RNA sequence: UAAAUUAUGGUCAAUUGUUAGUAUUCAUAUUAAUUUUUUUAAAUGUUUUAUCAUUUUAUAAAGGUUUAUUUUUGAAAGAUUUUUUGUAUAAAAUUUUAGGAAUAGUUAAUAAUAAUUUAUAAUUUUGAUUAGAUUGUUUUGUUAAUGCUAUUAGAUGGGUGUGGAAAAAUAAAAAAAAUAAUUAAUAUAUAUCAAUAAUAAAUUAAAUUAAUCUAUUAGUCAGAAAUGGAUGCCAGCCGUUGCGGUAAUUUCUAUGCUUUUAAAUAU
């Protein structure tokens, strides 16, 4: 591992590689991989009545 | 970290090959097509008149080199390398040699002076 | 280039080129002669052009239809193989 | 058609022009230098590969001793050798069908090979260029001219179709009894 | 063997034949041209030719797509290539069959020249090489007195480990003195002394 | 290998610097003495950086610019660069 | 000659026998990152660049390369790659325009495994058959508008539930409950 | 399996040229070579993939 | 089975041999004379044109043989002095002969056409060739000359002096003194003859 | 300048160059002395010819090398004057003794290099004795008349027309070549009759003649008069 | 590839080792054997044994192979638009590739090339090639076209049969027309009162139900335009009487009275007692629908002051050769076609007399 | 759910660091490079023509682009006596930053419409747009090896729009409409980024044409190789454990001695 890529440590390289790993990729189940925590508890106090046009 | 330089110096023997030193059958190309020199015309009587009528370009100042040739045969006996020995600059000596071989082909150095 | 000799018709002009290509009749005759000689060369040259053209066309016929022979046999074989695999299917 | 012409490497017509067979190699010390016979366009770009139609061959302009063949007391074979690789199917295609152009040096080569007659620029300065007058030429022509049909058929065989069918292969190709 | 397998010694070859010349319309004016200093070999290349896999099929005189060679002799004629000259245009082939007599093998003691064998120049004298453990050498022409069936081939197909090996490394890092096992050599002295040597 | 010690070589093996100060610093125990440290300057992309390096060199008649090379570690903590020659 | 050692070299101009004529590009350069910004203020909202950035595409490790072999090429013989696509219709807000979500394939040779990515297309349905949630076949064609190169070739599966849902005057599909994520906290009560 | 087989500059390691003909027709590239913008950086893509791997047909 | 497309007619070509054609012959393309030794070519060219054709190979072979009998007649008595500092060496003839024999028998140069010419080209006095070499072995054994290089004892100090083709003196090597006759070299000559 | 550094061309004849420090150094460590065993003059029983080929005047002048100091194997390059053709050259004794190397002209002395004496051609003194007088006179003209009439020897002749001296080949002068060698130019005999400078005028006579006759010149003329039973193949034209 | 300092194309085919002069190992005089093996020859990696590329490295089985047997069937499909473009291109190339530069044989070349490129040579191409070749007076190559079509198992339509029978008659070979007849046109009928006159096009053209699309193998879904599929619908206009006429001409040309009498009698009878079939409109592909142009900018008739220049707007020169002033043969009534048929037979009598 | 043989076939995968309790790809090794050396480049005036004009001569200036760059024959090739055709500008894949939020002359339909046509529009968390860095999809190095690690360079908007095609304002090494020339590859002293020269680095001599060059380093505790003399926690050594406290085989100096001989050292 060339030392100039990513951080000054080695493990930073493998931490950004986990971003490209095949079986780790973003889909309908696993979402917002890179910032999970900025979006957390965001809608707790947002009250949305669900959509029903059928009785 | 590699400060030490190469591990070995690989060198091969020189051992002369009896097969590569074997006599080579030779021909001289002057035998196949004989060389000759065209005698001067009334148009071009001297080597200096020649260098005068081959002078066209501003940068091919042929006429300035008249002294570096002793006679007629001296001119047509010159080739480019030996023509460099005598200290003629580059594109000038190409103009000269071109002119000479052209005269040899049956085309005399008749061309309009472009300097003006 | 087009050679412009010194005995071509001199144009007296200060606004343009000093020498117009216009020929002494001698120059015209001369030019005609030289050009006849090179005509002699290019006759054989283009003769060889079209000769090689038909050579290449003919070889293309023969090899290409040999190719079509072998190839058609191949694709006939493949097609047979397939409809068989589908009967089995 | 460039406003400020590229002065050093002019050509004729627009680029890319008709394909021309050239000899070219990178310049180096004379001891190692080779050339490439290449069909390419008239206007080259920086790297010669951009317009390159076909690669005709390598030509090495160094007379060589033949160490591949056994040393042969025959006089002529022990002259030095000059090695060249010609691709002649592509050559005959390009030259013949596509109607190429030719620089002079490749022409000299392919003349040596027997693909082309010697070039226009190869001059024994011994002989002059010939003279001509039409009445003498006419006397020679009236003296020898072949028959019209003979000539027409020769032009037929050289230019148009060569391979023809003798009556025999006709008779051998025409259907037999059940469909005859 | 000779009686039972007559076809194992080739007695036949494709004859060297002269090609007909193409007519030059320019006549004598150009006749000087194709007559020159040297021989000119021309081997064909293309999509159908030059592939080692197919080599024999391409040198086969029966095949009509056979690769074409030609040679201009210095007098201007043209002839077909001798079989040697044909084979010159393929990557070099090594034939040695070990099954009856030993083929001569490269990188031996009497084979390898000095600088590869030892890192020093060693004089080649035909008498008494102590390094090569020979007493004397009479030096006849190699394949002359020996029987021809005995000559088998040569084998270069291995690494010459005294000389050059793969993945070269220091055998021992300390002390600083040892190198890879290919560097064997005597010590060079403090500055050289030259004794005049007619003696 | 420690790649962050080389920060001011900026991917180069050697550097050119100008002399400014020369002061003395005491090494990490149990090594006592005075280690001579030269405080140098150089510029890259029109930024002027102050480099701080170990003076092992030989000073003759008064001179200005040195040649900086990176080493292994030395007695003195915090000083990565060493001096090759003085010009 | 790339197979010869450092010391074994004589001429640099030619290959004597054969092999590959190779230019050595110097791979180890110790290239470095210049730091022009304070860690506090970096002039981008979403991302920050603190180190040497790997560059190229396909020169990018770990390599991710186009995979021709997937469902779409499995079913179709395509004259040109991407000339056929099977997908679902997502939304019709535009007249004679069906948006279509489609999957394609990427291969990681390092790990020897495939991933499915997804991409949206604008397809041209004249006559407006496609209801959101249709399974459609889609083809490459004439340039139609700025972004539409694709047209709806065939409906594989129509949406029967969605069509009957429309017939009753209701939207084809209920509108998604939440939109895109935010970095704020919205306090909205009653 | 070794380094020499990494170098595709040999013609023995590289899928041959003619494949691209077999897919797009013979003498098809001579057209492409005369194109206005060529080889800076890009040329009309040259498809050479061993014919048993073709996604289209197989 | 019968769903999806009709069965391509060309399939028939598999089961029916009637449809396997080649419209043209092998060389009808203009290459017919490629095979120099085919009966077709012998019929087209006729015999005297084939003679004209192979004359060059015939004179190749005759050239080899002529060189060989020149060298034999020159060096036949093995020991003499034929030139200024140069004297006869059987070894010359030997090595040439080996060049010849390699032209024929080797698998690197394999020029075998040379051997098709022997029934004609080959000189009647050279038929016995190894016999002539044995005679040379008998002449090689003279006492005034060194048993190894065959240079004269009186006028020469070393093996290989003033010989162009000598094996015994190599480039940076050393000179070897003349070796003397005795049972060693006697049975060397003997084993060679054998 | 820069280009001074370029290695010269080494043609096929020449062995090892010694142009590099590595190639020079090990021979720089060889120091020769002339003893009684090394001295050329002791060995005249063998090398007598080699002794009588040395330039005794010129070597001691230019090289400061006495003739008693010259080893039979001597590596130094000294001046020679060929006792056959009489031309001067500079070589080392070692190379003339170890193999035969000597004046470069007498390399081409025989009609073909490949086969040295194999010629069956008569000498010049016989076939064309009228040539022997045109040789520039160095006193060696009796040795040069001894050569083959087919010989490729490069000799100098005094031109008939201008009385000056030029250099051509014996076989080029006679016109005759040996069977199996390369044919020369058909006109070579007429063209080498004179100087390269004096040759043009005489050979332009028949051309002016042929344009005087017919008012038209084509080089064709010779081949035409060559025209005023040939086996030929069956053709596929039909 | 070429001309660069690092140029690989020049090294990619085999060459004998070059020693002209000193290449750094002093190659002019030096025996390079070990230098050859350990240095000059490419190796697998630095220090490994030399990698041998020679003929002995490959197996024997490369030379056991017949030609072109390494090829596999290639299904290449392409857009419908592109099929039209390509078929047109091949058509106009078969007509003529170059202006005076076209050899007759070139039509044959282009048909063959069309096959080599994995296209199906449709009926238009065959008719065009045959008419071109025959009009160049080259009759063997015409039959060669036919044999190509037979080898591709393409069922000739009625039009194609006509063309090939024209080639047969002009060649005067009856034995061709007989096999052609026997194989293809046998069941060819005439048109009667109960017949329906020009038959509608009945073909579906080819589609896929979603189950056909998904569940079938790759080849069953592969549609290349194949001549055989519409052969029925090329024949929908009943050109039969032409075939019978041509066949009469052949049987006459080959000098056989009974067979000729047969065909000509069948034809005569049908022409008298059966309805006249509806003629087919002009084929879009063989002859092109005239496109609208203004004729305004044109060299005037008198444009050159020295002569009469013919012009695109009108012909001032006059007809060079007399034309018969009759519509194309298919537009005739049945009685008219009877007359035409007799004049045709006479013409063949004349031609045979001249041969 | 059975073995197999008419016997080595279808052509070579093979890994070398003297460490310091133990856990963890991390100093000192080899190969490849930068450190390092003037044996391959080059000078200005492009050229015809019908005369103040008109024909020929189309991708190396910079800027920094990651959903990005895409095209014809009407020029030339090119062959007939004149009207000659159709196919093109579109797309699909692969796209970087440790810690991540909104973007915008804006989508789609109409049409040779609309600076105010119609509409429930378009891009984004499957990571957008700005912003940093960066010349994109046959080129390298290491390696037994899925890897890791390189690859230059070249397409920067419009504004009388010429031309077949804008590629159009020094910087060739492309013969440019009569064979300028091919006995030519040599170009003197300049440059840019390349292009690996310590080429038998030491004893028998160069089948020459004798031309360029006069050519050296390191260690000396551990681990090949030591003694005097100073110095005294100082001066200094330091790849690393560590050394220096009047006896230092570890500093400095002198002399010897050691090396497996394209150098040490730095990155
Ligand atoms: Mg290094
Ligand atoms: Mg760093
Ligand atoms: Mg420390
Ligand atoms: Mg690798
Ligand atoms: Mg630019
Ligand atoms: Mg940016
Ligand atoms: Mg894309
Ligand atoms: Mg696009
Ligand atoms: Mg502007
Ligand atoms: Mg020790
Ligand atoms: Mg120290
Ligand atoms: Mg003290
Ligand atoms: Mg001490
Ligand atoms: Zn002896
Ligand atoms: Zn002499
Ligand atoms: Zn004279």
TrEMBL record, chain B:
Q: Provide the protein's localization.
A: Mitochondrion
Q: Which GO terms describe its cellular component?
A: kinetoplast; mitochondrial small ribosomal subunit; mitochondrion
Keyword terms, alphabetized: Mitochondrion
Principal place of residence: mitochondrion
Residue intervals of the Small ribosomal subunit protein mS41 SAM domain: 47-106
What is the similarity comment for this entry? Answer: Belongs to the mitochondrion-specific ribosomal protein mS41 family.
Protein name (record): Small ribosomal subunit protein mS41
Measured against the full-length protein, the chain present covers 10 to 125 of 187
Automatic annotation (TrEMBL), chain D:
Domain of life assignment = Eukaryota
Q: Which GO terms describe its cellular component?
A: cytoplasm; kinetoplast; mitochondrial small ribosomal subunit; mitochondrion
This one is known as: Uncharacterized protein
UniProtKB/TrEMBL annotation, chain G:
Tagged with keyword DNA damage: no
Write out the entry's keywords from A to Z.
Answer: Metal-binding, Ribonucleoprotein, Ribosomal protein
- Give the species this sequence originates from: Trypanosoma brucei brucei (strain 927/4 GUTat10.1)
Residues recorded as binding Mg(2+), renumbered to this chain, are 30
User: What name is this protein filed under?
Assistant: 30S Ribosomal protein S17, putative
| Biological processes per GO annotation | translation
**Organism's domain of life?**
Eukaryota
- Ribosomal protein as UniProt keyword: yes
Q: GO molecular function, one example?
A: structural constituent of ribosome
Similarity section? Belongs to the universal ribosomal protein uS17 family.
Q: GO cellular component terms? A: cytoplasm; mitochondrial small ribosomal subunit; mitochondrion; organellar small ribosomal subunit; ribosome
UniProtKB/TrEMBL annotation, chain K:
Q: In its UniProt entry, what is this protein called?
A: Uncharacterized protein
- Complete-protein stretch covered: 52 to 406 of 812
């Amino acid at each position: 591992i060339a030392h100039w890529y990513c951080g000054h440590k080695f493990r930073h390289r493998f931490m950004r590689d986990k971003r490209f790993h095949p079986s780790l990729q973003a889909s309908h189940d696993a979402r917002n991989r890179f910032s999970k925590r900025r979006h957390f508890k965001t809608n707790r106090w947002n009250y949305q009545q669900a959509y029903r046009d059928m009785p | 970290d590699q400060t030490y330089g190469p591990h070995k110096s690989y060198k091969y023997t020189y051992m002369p090959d009896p097969r590569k030193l074997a006599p080579i059958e030779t021909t001289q190309r002057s035998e196949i097509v004989p060389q000759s020199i065209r005698p001067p015309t009334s148009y071009v009587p001297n080597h200096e008149t020649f260098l005068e009528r081959a002078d066209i370009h501003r940068l091919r100042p042929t006429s300035d080199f008249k002294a570096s040739f002793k006679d007629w045969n001296d001119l047509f006996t010159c080739d480019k390398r030996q023509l460099r020995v005598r200290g003629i600059p580059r594109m000038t000596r190409d103009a000269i040699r071109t002119a000479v071989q052209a005269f040899q082909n049956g085309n005399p150095p008749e061309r309009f002076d472009t300097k003006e | 280039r087009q050679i412009r000799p010194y005995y071509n018709l001199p144009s007296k002009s200060e606004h343009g080129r000093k020498m117009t290509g216009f020929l002494t009749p001698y120059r015209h005759w001369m030019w005609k002669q030289n050009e006849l000689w090179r005509n002699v060369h290019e006759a054989q040259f283009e003769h060889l052009r079209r000769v090689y053209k038909r050579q290449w066309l003919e070889s293309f016929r023969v090899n290409a239809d040999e190719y079509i022979y072998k190839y058609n046999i191949t694709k006939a074989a493949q097609l047979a193989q397939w409809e068989c695999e589908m009967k089995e299917q | 058609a460039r406003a400020v012409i590229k002065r050093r490497s002019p050509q004729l017509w627009g680029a890319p022009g008709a394909p021309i067979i050239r000899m070219r190699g990178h310049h180096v010390v004379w001891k190692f230098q080779s050339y490439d016979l290449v069909v390419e366009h008239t206007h080259k770009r920086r790297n010669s590969d951009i317009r390159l139609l076909h690669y005709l061959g390598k030509h090495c302009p160094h007379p060589q001793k033949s160490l591949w063949s056994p040393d042969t007391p025959v006089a002529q074979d022990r002259h030095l050798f000059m090695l060249t690789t010609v691709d002649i199917d592509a050559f005959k295609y390009w030259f013949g069908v596509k109607r190429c152009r030719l620089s002079m040096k490749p022409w000299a080569l392919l003349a040596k090979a027997g693909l082309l007659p010697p070039s226009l620029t190869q001059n024994s300065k011994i002989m002059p260029k010939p003279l001509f007058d039409k009445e003498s030429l006419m006397r020679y022509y009236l003296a020898n001219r072949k028959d019209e049909d003979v000539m027409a058929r020769e032009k037929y065989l050289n230019y148009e179709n060569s391979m023809v069918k003798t009556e025999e292969e006709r008779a051998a190709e025409r259907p037999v009894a059940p469909y005859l | 063997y000779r009686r039972m397998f007559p076809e194992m010694i080739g007695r036949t070859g494709e004859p060297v034949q002269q090609y007909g010349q193409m007519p030059i319309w320019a006549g004598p004016h150009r006749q000087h041209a194709n007559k020159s200093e040297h021989n000119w070999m021309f081997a064909e290349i293309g999509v159908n030719v030059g592939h080692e896999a197919l080599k024999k099929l391409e040198l086969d005189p029966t095949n009509e797509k056979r690769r074409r060679f030609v040679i201009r002799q210095p007098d201007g004629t043209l002839r077909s290539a001798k079989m040697s000259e044909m084979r010159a245009w393929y990557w070099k082939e090594e034939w040695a069959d070990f099954r009856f007599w030993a083929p001569q093998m490269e990188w031996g003691i009497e084979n390898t020249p000095s600088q590869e064998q030892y890192q020093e120049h060693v004089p080649d004298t035909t008498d008494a090489d102590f390094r090569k453990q020979r007493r004397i050498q009479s030096r006849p022409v190699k394949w002359f007195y020996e029987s021809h069936y005995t000559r088998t081939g040569s084998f270069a197909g291995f690494q010459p480990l005294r000389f050059m090996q793969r993945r070269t490394e220091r055998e021992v890092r300390w002390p600083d003195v040892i190198n890879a096992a290919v560097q064997i050599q005597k010590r060079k002295p403090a500055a050289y002394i030259f004794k005049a040597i007619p003696e | 290998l420690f790649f962050l010690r080389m920060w001011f070589l900026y991917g180069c093996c050697l550097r050119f610097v100008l002399f400014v100060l020369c002061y003395y610093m005491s090494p990490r125990l149990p090594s006592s003495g005075n280690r001579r440290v030269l405080y140098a300057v150089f510029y890259l992309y029109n930024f002027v950086w102050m480099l701080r390096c170990f003076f092992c060199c030989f000073i003759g008649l008064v001179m200005s610019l040195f040649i900086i090379e990176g080493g292994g570690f030395v007695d003195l903590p915090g000083v990565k660069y060493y001096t090759r020659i003085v010009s | 000659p790339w197979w010869n050692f450092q010391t074994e070299h004589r001429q640099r101009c030619v290959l004597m026998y054969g092999g590959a004529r190779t230019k050595n590009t110097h791979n180890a350069n110790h290239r470095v990152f210049i730091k022009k910004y304070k860690r506090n203020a970096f002039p981008n909202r979403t991302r920050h660049h603190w180190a040497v950035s790997m560059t190229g595409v396909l020169s990018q490790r770990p390599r991710r390369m186009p995979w021709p072999y997937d469902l779409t090429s499995l079913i179709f013989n395509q004259p040109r790659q991407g000339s056929d696509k099977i997908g679902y219709v997502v939304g019709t807000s535009m007249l004679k325009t069906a948006v279509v979500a489609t999957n394609h394939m990427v291969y990681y040779p390092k790990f020897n495994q495939r991933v499915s990515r997804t991409k949206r297309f604008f397809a041209h349905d004249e006559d407006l058959a496609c209801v959101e949630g249709d399974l459609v076949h889609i083809k490459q064609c004439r340039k139609i508008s700025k972004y539409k190169h694709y047209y709806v070739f065939s409906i594989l599966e129509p949406n029967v539930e969605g069509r009957e849902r429309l017939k009753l005057g209701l939207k084809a599909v209920p509108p998604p409950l939440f939109g895109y994520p935010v970095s704020r906290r919205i306090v909205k009560l009653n | 399996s070794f380094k020499y087989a990494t170098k595709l500059q040999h013609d023995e390691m590289r899928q041959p040229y003619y494949i691209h003909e077999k897919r797009y027709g013979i003498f098809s590239n001579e057209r492409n070579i005369a194109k206005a913008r060529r080889g800076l950086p890009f040329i009309t893509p040259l498809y050479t993939k061993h014919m048993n791997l073709w996604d289209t047909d197989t | 089975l019968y769903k999806g497309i009709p069965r391509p007619a060309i399939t028939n070509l598999h089961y029916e041999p009637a449809w396997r054609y080649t419209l043209y012959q092998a060389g009808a393309h203009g290459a017919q004379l490629s095979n120099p030794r085919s009966p077709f070519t012998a019929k087209v060219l006729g015999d005297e044109l084939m003679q004209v054709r192979d004359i060059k190979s015939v004179e190749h072979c005759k050239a080899w043989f002529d060189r060989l009998q020149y060298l034999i007649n020159l060096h036949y008595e093995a020991v003499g002095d034929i030139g200024e500092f140069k004297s006869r060496h059987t070894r010359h003839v030997h090595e040439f002969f080996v060049a010849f024999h390699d032209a024929l028998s080797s698998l690197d140069f394999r020029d075998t056409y040379l051997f098709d010419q022997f029934k004609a080209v080959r000189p009647p006095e050279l038929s016995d060739l190894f016999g002539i070499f044995l005679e040379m072995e008998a002449n090689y054994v003279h006492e005034d000359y060194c048993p190894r290089c065959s240079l004269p004892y009186s006028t020469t100090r070393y093996c290989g002096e003033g010989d162009v083709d000598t094996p015994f003196r190599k480039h940076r090597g050393r000179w070897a003194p003349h070796q003397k006759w005795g049972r060693e070299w006697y049975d060397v000559v003997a084993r060679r003859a054998e | 300048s820069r280009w001074s550094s370029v290695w010269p061309n080494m043609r096929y004849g020449s062995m090892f160059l010694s142009y590099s420090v590595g190639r020079k150094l090990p021979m720089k460590g060889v120091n020769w002395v002339t003893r009684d065993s090394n001295r050329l003059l002791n060995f005249s029983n063998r090398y007598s010819a080699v002794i009588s080929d040395i330039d005794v005047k010129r070597t001691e002048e230019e090289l400061n090398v006495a003739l008693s100091d010259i080893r039979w194997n001597d590596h130094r390059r000294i001046y020679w004057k060929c006792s056959f053709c009489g031309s001067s050259y500079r070589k080392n004794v070692s190379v003339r003794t170890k193999y035969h190397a000597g004046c470069n002209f007498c390399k081409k002395k025989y009609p073909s290099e490949v086969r040295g004496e194999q010629h069956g051609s008569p000498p010049v003194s016989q076939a064309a004795p009228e040539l022997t007088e045109q040789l520039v006179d160095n006193g060696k003209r009796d040795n040069l008349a001894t050569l083959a009439v087919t010989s490729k020897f490069y000799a100098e002749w005094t031109c008939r027309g201008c009385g000056g001296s030029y250099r051509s080949t014996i076989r080029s002068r006679t016109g005759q070549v040996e069977a199996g060698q390369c044919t020369l130019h058909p006109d070579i005999v007429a063209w080498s009759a004179y100087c390269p400078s004096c040759s043009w005028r005489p050979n332009m006579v028949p051309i002016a003649e042929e344009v005087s006759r017919s008012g038209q010149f084509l080089g064709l003329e010779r081949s035409m008069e060559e025209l005023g039973p040939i086996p030929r193949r069956k053709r596929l034209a039909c | 590839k070429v001309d660069s300092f690092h140029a690989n194309t020049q090294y990619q085919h085999a060459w004998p080792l070059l020693s002209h002069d000193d290449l750094g190992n002093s190659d002019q005089s030096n025996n390079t054997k070990n230098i050859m093996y350990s240095m000059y020859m490419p190796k697998r990696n630095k220090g490994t044994a030399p990698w041998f590329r020679g003929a002995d490295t490959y197996s024997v089985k490369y030379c056991e192979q017949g030609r072109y047997e390494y090829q596999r069937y290639l299904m290449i499909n392409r857009f419908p638009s592109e099929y039209k473009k390509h078929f047109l291109s091949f058509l106009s190339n078969i007509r003529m590739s170059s202006g005076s530069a076209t050899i007759p044989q070139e039509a044959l070349h282009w048909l063959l090339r069309m096959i080599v490129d994995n296209f199906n040579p449709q009926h238009v191409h065959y008719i065009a090639a045959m008419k071109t070749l025959q009009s160049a007076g080259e009759l063997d190559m015409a039959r060669d076209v036919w044999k190509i079509m037979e080898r591709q198992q393409t069922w000739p339509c009625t039009a194609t049969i006509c063309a090939y029978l024209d080639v047969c008659v002009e060649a005067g070979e009856k034995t061709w027309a007989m096999e052609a007849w026997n194989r293809y046109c046998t069941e060819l009928k005439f048109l009667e009162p109960g017949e329906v006159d020009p038959k509608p096009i009945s073909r579906v053209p080819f589609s896929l139900t979603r189950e056909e699309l998904l569940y079938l193998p790759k080849w069953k879904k592969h549609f290349d335009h194949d001549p055989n599929l519409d052969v029925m619908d090329l024949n929908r206009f009943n050109r039969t009487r032409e075939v019978y006429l041509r066949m009469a001409q052949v049987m006459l040309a080959g000098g056989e009275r009974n067979a000729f009498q047969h065909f000509f009698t069948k034809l005569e009878e049908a022409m008298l007692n059966k309805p006249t079939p509806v003629p087919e409109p002009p084929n879009p592909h063989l002859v092109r629908r005239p496109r609208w142009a203004p004729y305004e900018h044109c060299k005037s008739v008198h444009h050159s002051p020295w002569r009469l220049q013919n012009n695109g707007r009108a012909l001032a020169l006059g007809p060079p050769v007399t034309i018969e002033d009759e519509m194309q043969s298919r537009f005739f009534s049945n009685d008219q076609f009877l007359v035409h048929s007799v004049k045709e037979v006479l013409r063949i009598v004349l031609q045979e007399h001249k041969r």
